[PDB]
Amino acid sequence: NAMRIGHGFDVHKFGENGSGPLIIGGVRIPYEKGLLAHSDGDVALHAATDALLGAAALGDIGKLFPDTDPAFKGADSRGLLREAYRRILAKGYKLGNLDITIIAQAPKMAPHIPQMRVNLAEDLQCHMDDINVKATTTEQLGFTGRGEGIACEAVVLLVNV
Amino acid sequence: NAMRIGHGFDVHKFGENGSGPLIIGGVRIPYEKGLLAHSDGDVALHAATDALLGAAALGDIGKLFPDTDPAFKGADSRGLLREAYRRILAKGYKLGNLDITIIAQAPKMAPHIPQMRVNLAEDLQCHMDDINVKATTTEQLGFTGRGEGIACEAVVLLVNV
Amino acid sequence: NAMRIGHGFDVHKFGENGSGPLIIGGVRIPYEKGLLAHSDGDVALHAATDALLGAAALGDIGKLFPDTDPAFKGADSRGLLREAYRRILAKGYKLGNLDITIIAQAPKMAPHIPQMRVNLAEDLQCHMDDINVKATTTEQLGFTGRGEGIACEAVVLLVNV
Ligand SMILES: Nc1ccn([C@@H]2O[C@H](COP(=O)(O)OP(=O)(O)OP(=O)(O)O)[C@@H](O)[C@H]2O)c(=O)n1
Ligand SMILES: Nc1ccn([C@@H]2O[C@H](COP(=O)(O)OP(=O)(O)OP(=O)(O)O)[C@@H](O)[C@H]2O)c(=O)n1
Ligand SMILES: Nc1ccn([C@@H]2O[C@H](COP(=O)(O)OP(=O)(O)OP(=O)(O)O)[C@@H](O)[C@H]2O)c(=O)n1
Ligand SMILES: [Cl-]
Ligand SMILES: [Mg+2]
Ligand SMILES: [Mg+2]
Ligand SMILES: [Mg+2]
Ligand SMILES: [Mg+2]
Structure with missing residues (x-):
């Protein structure tokens, strides 16, 4: 089967005016609060990982990396993504293309997108x-x-290798 | 045209502490409230049906099965899905793959996913x-x-047969 | 690369009981409020444009048509869509298919969908x-x-021409 579609959706709650500021899409963004989460809280990488695992019918991030497991407290989301992608390649698929929509009142994401x-x-x-x-x-x-x-x-498309 | 993409989105409001508990993805899940709706209220099957009808440019569930029509009060969502899929096959398409994201604070969906x-x-x-x-x-x-x-x-992908 | 996937998401806040009524999907819909926005506020065309630009990895509407720029105050969203599509064609892609889900408590969209x-x-x-x-x-x-x-x-699919 030639191509597979995947969808991911993820939410994080801000902490207070201590929080150690945003990481989104692996980029550290200046801000008064950070996102509380078991790992680094990178909403954009989570949504993307789920889209990939979902296209591969591998479940989601919770399936691959139990939230219960203390080995992932403050886990780097980029590392989680790379592991999932490794599994997707193992299963015979590679990325066709990915599209992400961050939904946030603030801060501005545009400077960090590249x-x-x-x-x-x-x-x-x-x-x-x-x-x-x-x-x-x-x-x-x-x-x-x-x-x-x-x-x-x-949202993501996998192509069969 | 080789492949077609479809998207579905659906919401239901919980009833009170009578409600006869959840059906999600055709699975009856233990809970203190159920989802109010004209049919069984299966949010996951609704979203999936719409993704399928949408990929087929057949509209949505409301198009195929008027909400006004009393023949569908408490209708089994699995039956609605099967009917829609029948129509999609009639039009020359079959499922490539489907991906669903349930968004719920509770109860836990994971045990029921298989x-x-x-x-x-x-x-x-x-x-x-x-x-x-x-x-x-x-x-x-x-x-x-x-x-x-x-x-x-x-989110769904249809393949041309 | 044969096919590309794209996703768009857009929100607008209603104005008060003056507002000059809805435009959605280029259709003027009778209503007590309109949607406030820099351009005509057509949520459905915005979401669609973003899905297209996103599939093309061209960013989003803000990338092509700065919100800061006064040349787009009250801009016709259909015009913005046509310009984006022109760019997508320039890049070697055409529409495979598009699917849109409007999320609104009111007014009724169904009469205007055709x-x-x-x-x-x-x-x-x-x-x-x-x-x-x-x-x-x-x-x-x-x-x-x-x-x-x-x-x-x-949600959208582009096909390589
Ligand atoms: N946290 C955010 C949110 C938005 N944006 C930027 O602002 C643009 C759109 O913001 P928004 O106010 O949501 O735009 P529209 O809803 O489309 O406004 P309009 O009705 O005037 O078209 C985007 O393309 C994006 O580059 C951003 O940098 N950071
Ligand atoms: N009603 C729900 C909601 C979530 N889950 C499970 O919990 C996991 C994710 O829940 P959530 O708290 O939303 O996780 P994250 O937001 O990704 O948390 P983190 O920031 O720590 O990664 C999922 O993979 C799913 O298996 C569930 O069973 N039932
Ligand atoms: N602003 C809106 C919202 C909904 N609809 C119509 O109403 C139908 C679904 O509305 P909704 O109340 O959201 O339906 P369901 O949630 O699926 O209800 P049920 O649980 O009974 O299946 C759609 O197919 C659509 O044609 C509409 O015309 N305009
Ligand atoms: Cl709210
Ligand atoms: Mg986390
Ligand atoms: Mg809300
Ligand atoms: Mg129902
Ligand atoms: Mg506008």
Whole structure:
């Protein structure tokens, strides 16, 4: 079977005005709060990993890396992504292309998108043209608009090698 | 045209502490409330049906099965899915693969995912490897995090027969 | 590379009981409020444009048409869509198919869907069978259910010409 589709969706709640600031798409972004989570809280990498595992019918991140397991407290999401991708390659698939939509009232994602694409293209061993990332606001509506957290949605295509 | 993409999204509000407990992905899940709806309220099957009808440019579930029509009060969502799939086959398409993301603060979906995949693979007459299901929390943010309802998002690929 | 996937997501907040009523999918829909936005606020066309640009790894609408730029105040979203599609064709891709899910408590989208599909098929120079549009409610949950805005989600497939 030639191609497979995958979808990922992930949310994190902000901490308080201590938090050690954002990592999104492997990029450290300046901000007054960070996202609370078992690992580094990288919403964009989580959504992307799930899209990949989902396309491969491998479940999701929780399947591969139990949230219960203390070996992943503060785990680097880029490492989790690379491991999942390794498994996807093992199963005979490689990335066709990926598209990510970050949903956050703030901070601005646009300055960091090029580096995010760099990190992803590295991690998924492909050309940067196979990675798209956008960011969008929720016009101050709902919990993202209220600034209580950031959500991220990802969509992916795997090609059979 | 070789392949077609489809997306589905569906939400249901919980009832009170009577409700007759969850059906999700055709699986009856133990819980203090059920989801109010015209049919059985199976959010995951609704999202999946819409993804399929959407890929086929057949509209959505409301198009095929009027919500107004009393013949579908408490309708089995698996039956609705099978009917839609019948129509998709009629139009010359079959499932490539499906991926589903349930968004619910509770109860835990993970124990039921294998059976959900069984029901879907049966319904869409395919191998279980063409079905992925994940569940995710919203970290207690928004109406799902607040426990007022469950949302579900589905993505699908149809292949031309 | 044969096919590319894209995802779009967009939200707009309603104005007050002046607002000059809805445009969605290029269709003017009767309503007591309109959606506030820099351009015409057409959530469905925005989500679709982003899905297209995202599949093409061209970023999103903000990339092509700065929100800062006064040349796009009240810009027609259909025009923005046509420009983006022009760029996608330039890059060697054409629409495979598109699917859109409008998320709105009200007004009813169903009466307008056929015209929306007409506008899109015109804009993306394809057959209406390559366009699907659905609408869904959020059962009065969250900010859409509360009627403070409308959200829209789009998914797309590009084929290499
Ligand atoms: N956290 C965020 C959110 C948005 N953006 C940028 O702002 C643009 C869109 O933001 P938004 O206010 O959500 O735009 P629209 O909803 O499309 O506004 P309009 O109705 O005027 O088209 C995006 O392309 C993105 O580059 C960003 O950098 N960081
Ligand atoms: N109703 C739910 C919600 C979640 N899960 C399980 O819990 C995992 C993820 O839950 P969540 O708390 O949403 O995880 P993350 O947001 O990814 O947490 P982290 O930041 O620590 O990675 C999933 O893989 C799923 O198996 C579940 O069984 N039932
Ligand atoms: N703003 C809206 C929202 C919904 N609809 C129509 O109503 C149907 C579904 O609405 P909804 O109440 O969201 O349906 P379900 O959630 O699927 O209800 P049920 O549980 O009974 O299946 C759709 O197919 C659509 O045609 C509409 O015209 N305009
Ligand atoms: Cl909310
Ligand atoms: Mg984490
Ligand atoms: Mg129902
Ligand atoms: Mg606008
Ligand atoms: Mg909400």
